[PDB]
From Swiss-Prot, chains A, B:
Expressed in all tissues, with highest expression in lung and ovary. This is Protocadherin-18. Glycans are attached at N76, N242, N393. Interacts with DAB1. The chain holds residues 28 to 455 of 1135 of the full protein. Residues 1-428 are extracellular.
Length: 428, 428
């Protein structure tokens, strides 16, 4: 005869499932000498989960019944057990089937306690990252049901089911990440089943935010006015530029250089340190040639898709008194630097020489005072700016002196003052 | 007296500019013997540009007058020089100012003929790149006025003016660039002034498009279904994955790996080649333990801000006949494998043995044929699936023989078939 029974797993050893006397009365009481029958179980002596009492026919749990090690994740679980009546003469055969129900004696569990995941700050709102699945060997209501993520402002989870039915958690970036502000997170993922009592397991996700090159260098200020004495030595520090980049590694490492469009002249006279940004002089400047310079400097990081920053540096040169006045004396005489005077006297206010002075410099450094200091009484008459005339101031005397020596002094209004002197003689 | 004249540069040497005798008549005609006066130029510097005719006072070009070498880029240009009348008796002084005008005898020119510029395809519509400025030593309308860029579909040009008045060209990205399609451009930039005849100069732009990581790997298919014999040797090639990335260098170098969320079990049994994508078996499979696998494999490039690609590989394991049938024979005898039989003549169909068979496999590989072989007159009667009884089939006349030896055959319906044999003796 066939008998079917229904138990819960892990019940205490020795508990009775059924009593043959009570359930197979129709068979036992119809044998010869009903009270003399004895029972024998048909199993091996290794791990007998069900046992029969040979004297009264009690079917009781012999060893622990773990549904999980027995049927794994199958919904249907049942143990088979054959019992026979002794003696052999007209023995009966009882095939006993015990359906095993599952209790919730297993909590959700994670493979690893630390779940390291790396996310680039570039990751767009909506990015999804499947997380480790917890394992719950139970079945039905007792198996893994849902997940939950510790409260925070940047991540969520959606619970999903894959092809085979199992459930898993998908991490979702819901707010724009920024490594420059918060580089790492630590959040708790909790899996829980739907059993009674409800069980839970948990793991910690260590989210690390990798840097992307979402920031370019920045200058303190964009414009600069530098004054430079035209006599500064090669190597003078014109300006130490400082730019900053919040990014990490190469993305935040800055290189300074002259903008790609700078004129060659600027590169001829100035040099910029690629690493520290020391704008230095390479060959001296001359106010008498170019009075100003408009340098365009750029700073760019060594990261990908890099946008550069730029600042403008105006170098204004200032004049120094590095040019001495020039004296030119011109005469009517076609040949030489000598002024010919009539042997026998001459009239007053007679043209002797034209005098022109000039100074390369500017301002007071280029303004000239001219003085005539010959050994006599000639007069230096102004005609226009920096152009004077040399004339006489009284009637001369041939007999007294024949050779004259005149000296012109040109002295600019600079400090230190500079001056030159020229000499020429008057033959009469 | 002051005299002002207006001439053009580069005029034919020897041409007459003005006649002093004619222009200072109002002064000469008030002298004694106006017709005897002669003129002398006060030519200063090592620059003999203009000459005076001593007899009539004609001002003629002594040497070529190049406005560019004299006043450079200044609007106001003039040569100043003093001329005097002979004889000295009340000689006159004429200050002459000769304004030199500019002709368009110089074309715009570029410092370098090839202008190499590098642009990353990531550069957004609107990016601007100031380009080298050409230099035109002319002045006014004759100097650099406008620029022009060879016709194209990806770049535009805007003309600009800097603080000091000079003009420059700003390159503009007008349409989204894509290096994967077109890696370089070559465009002609022409600077032209506004003189008549209009003169022009040109340089060529070598535009290089640097690659950015704007593409992630791609798989041929999204999922793959693999059937796998549970007896395949370690190393069987399950699948050769091919992913492609159009990017350059590291951006296009692909790495294959198991997704970070795969279970340790999957990594215990499978291996993926990081470089070529060879999904191979690491530890043999057993259909009797796990029947399928859902592998999540990813391929990502070695570039920045990299998004990985994903493919799902479903491995269906298939049963083979790799388990032999198992026989359990149970008897009355508690000690050893001999079944003690009633010495006295027994009736037909008397219990001798209980026999159970089983097979781990599935389908025909798990279907068992059970057969009873022996000396004679025994019957193997089925009770239920894979469970039979050994009984007697004739009157046990002890006289014939006392010892019997019986052999039980379990042979599954697999291919190749597997079998188990049991032996036990029947004493009467
Ligand atoms: C992934 O890419 C794999 C590579 O295939 C190429 O990839 C790139 C580089 C391009 O060239 C592209 O055009 C190619 O597709 C690809 O695997 C290939 O698959 C084919 C069949 O699908 C294979 O052809 C078969 O080759 C074997 C062996 O020959 C090879 O191996 C020997 C030993 O190493 C070498 O000496 C040879 O030079 C070959 O390289 C043959 O035995 C076989 O012949 C039999 O099968 C064909 C039909 O396939 C019949 O017509 C014949 O009559 C025979 O019955 C084929 O010739 C090819 O070998 C293989 N190459 C690999 C793996 O490198 C794969 O399909 C792509 N996708 C996936 C999902 O795997
Ligand atoms: C760029 O930065 C440098 C360095 O400044 C220092 O380092 C940076 C990384 C930042 O952390 C700064 O906050 C930090 O101060 C600047 O150079 C520094 O300039 C100052 C003056 O501005 C120097 O100190 C002065 O030196 C004079 C002359 O001897 C004294 O009379 C003053 O009493 C005062 O001490 C300082 O020495 C100098 N640093 C070094 C290392 O030489 C630099 O100015 C700056 N660039 C710009 C454009 O501001
Ligand atoms: C899993 O169990 C179902 C449920 O039915 C069974 O009912 C009892 C008879 C007993 O067997 C209990 O353990 C189960 O709860 C099975 O469904 C039956 O399957 C048989 C044949 O397989 C079929 O003839 C019946 O009609 C089915 N019953 C119903 C209500 O539809 C199912 O077969 C079991 N699956 C496996 C793989 O064993
Ligand atoms: C030029 O001639 C005039 C004629 O009157 C003189 O006055 C200048 O000399 C100065 O003036 C007189 C009044 C006297 O005080 C004399 O001592 C002055 O030096 C004369 N100048 C020169 C430089 O010879
Ligand atoms: C230069 O010439 C202009 C005419 O274009 C005139 O207006 C100006 O006065 C001149 N520059 C001077 C006088 O400094
Ligand atoms: C057992 O003996 C009977 C007697 O006729 C016979 O019919 C039967 O075939 C025998 N058993 C087997 C398995 O042949
Ligand atoms: Ca259990
Ligand atoms: Ca359980
Ligand atoms: Ca559970
Ligand atoms: Ca950021
Ligand atoms: Ca940066
Ligand atoms: Ca960053
Ligand atoms: Ca100088
Ligand atoms: Ca100077
Ligand atoms: Ca001076
Ligand atoms: Ca010229
Ligand atoms: Ca010119
Ligand atoms: Ca020109
Ligand atoms: Ca592209
Ligand atoms: Ca690209
Ligand atoms: Ca790529
Ligand atoms: Ca197997
Ligand atoms: Ca098998
Ligand atoms: Ca088998
Ligand atoms: Na610096
Ligand atoms: Na491959």
């Amino acid at each position: 005869k066939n008998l079917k029974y229904r138990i819960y797993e892990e019940q205490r050893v020795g508990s009775v499932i059924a009593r043959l006397s009570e359930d197979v009365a129709d068979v036992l009481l119809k044998l010869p000498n009903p009270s003399t029958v004895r029972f024998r179980a048909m199993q091996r002596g290794n791990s007998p989960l069900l046992v029969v009492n040979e004297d009264n026919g009690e079917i009781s749990i012999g060893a622990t019944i773990d549904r999980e090690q027995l049927c794994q994740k199958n919904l249907n679980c049942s143990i088979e057990f054959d019992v026979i009546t002794l003696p052999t003469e007209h023995l009966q055969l009882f095939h006993i089937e015990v359906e095993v129900l599952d209790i919730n004696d297993n909590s959700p569990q994670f493979s690893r306690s630390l779940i390291p995941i790396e996310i680039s700050e570039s990751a767009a709102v909506g990015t999804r990252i499947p997380l480790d699945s917890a394992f719950d060997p139970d079945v039905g209501e007792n198996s893994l049901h849902t997940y939950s993520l510790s409260a925070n402002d940047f991540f969520n989870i959606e619970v999903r089911t894959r092809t085979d039915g199992a459930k898993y958690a998908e991490l979702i970036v819901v707010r724009e990440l920024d490594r420059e502000l918060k580089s790492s997170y630590e959040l708790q993922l909790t899996a829980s089943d739907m059993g009674v009592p409800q069980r839970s397991g948990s793991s910690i996700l260590k989210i690390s935010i990798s840097d992307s090159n979402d920031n370019s260098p920045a200058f303190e200020q964009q414009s600069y006015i530098i004054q430079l004495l035209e006599n500064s030595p090669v190597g003078t520090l014109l300006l130490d530029l400082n730019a900053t980049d919040p990014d990490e590694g190469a993305n935040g490492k800055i290189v300074y250089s002259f903008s790609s469009h700078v004129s060659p002249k600027i590169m001829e006279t100035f040099k910029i340190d690629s690493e520290r940004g020391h704008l230095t002089l390479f060959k001296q400047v001359d106010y008498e040639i170019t009075k100003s310079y408009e340098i365009d400097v750029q700073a760019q990081d060594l990261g990908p898709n890099s946008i550069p920053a730029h600042c403008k540096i105006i170098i204004k040169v200032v004049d120094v008194n590095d040019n001495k006045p020039e004296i030119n004396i011109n005469l009517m005489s076609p040949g030489k630097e000598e002024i010919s005077y009539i042997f026998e006297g001459d009239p007053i206010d007679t043209f002797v020489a034209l005098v022109r002075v000039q100074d390369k410099d500017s301002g007071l450094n280029g303004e000239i005072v001219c003085k005539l200091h010959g050994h006599g009484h000639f007069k230096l008459q102004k005609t226009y700016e920096n152009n004077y005339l040399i004339l006489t101031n009284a009637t001369l005397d041939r007999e007294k002196r024949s050779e004259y020596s005149l000296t012109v002094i040109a002295e600019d209004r600079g400090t230190p003052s500079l001056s030159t002197v020229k000499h020429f003689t008057v033959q009469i």
